[PDB]
Design a protein around this ligand. Sequence first.
Ligand SMILES: O=C(O)CNC(=O)C(=O)O
Ligand SMILES: [Mg+2]
Ligand code: NI
Ligand SMILES: [Zn+2]
Length: 331
Amino acid sequence: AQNPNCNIMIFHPTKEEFNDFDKYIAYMESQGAHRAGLAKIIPPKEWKARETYDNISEILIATPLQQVASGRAGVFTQYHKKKKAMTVGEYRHLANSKKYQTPPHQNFEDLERKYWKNRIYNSPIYGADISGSLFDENTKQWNLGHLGTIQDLLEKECGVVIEGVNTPYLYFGMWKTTFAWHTEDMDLYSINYLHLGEPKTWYVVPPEHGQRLERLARELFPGSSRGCGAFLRHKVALISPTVLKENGIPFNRITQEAGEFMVTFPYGYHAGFNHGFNCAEAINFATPRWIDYGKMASQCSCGEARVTFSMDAFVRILQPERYDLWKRGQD
Ligand SMILES: O=C(O)CNC(=O)C(=O)O
Ligand SMILES: [Mg+2]
Ligand code: NI
Ligand SMILES: [Zn+2]
């Protein structure tokens, strides 16, 4: 079995290998990359996403979110407080202000120490889930707006034609902006491209060990667990690397820099934080290997998770027994 320790693998495809996206995902899996739950892909030196990022300041962040924490430094939740609209240029100025800017630090490990010591005492503001793309239309390789759709993959594998669409989303981050522990909707893959700015640190649990993380989370967040048998779908819970190590949970970490792609694999729990002002693009995708994970994905039916229109068909076709309860949680 390849990659039996479930290490995060880093790939350097050539320009020729960058042509066929599906083929390269299958290649990474042949080398065991999925066992980690996360892989990094460094694009060939000849590739670029677009010409420049000099003209993005007028993008609107309609509903910036202030991420307010509760709990203790290593075990906390966050809620999202809505703020007034602002442009990307206004958000960048805010991220660089004395109140929000990255502190002085020695290296990524020092900044990680500072994040986990001090995150809860601040409330950073995030632009999230903004439909759109910063890939040039003429970028033909690894263009996250031109991928094969999940509806087409389900139709190809299973024969059923369904409604729904699959488009990318932009993220604008600042120091201490935080992504809570989660798997993707319907335990899909994700791909994330860091277009510009400061890094993102990621944490990930191997898919084969995801239930260990779920059991610790039920212990650490006992009221949330009574409220919902899939409360990690709410995307509000944080647990530090120190707490994970104290509890014997297998995980890995890596820092993504501008110009790099990350792929998350089905049922790979992940979390992380941004180092400073940045912009990322991400989308969900599927492969044949996903179908069995989609069929087994947990679901939230308590009302908290609320998701896109296009998830309806996935539940309806892959999880007909669960569909009526889940749809009620959507309504
Ligand atoms: O960059 C972001 O805010 C979030 N993206 C991811 O967690 C992902 O691609 O799965
Ligand atoms: Mg603009
Ligand atoms: Ni994710
Ligand atoms: Zn729920």
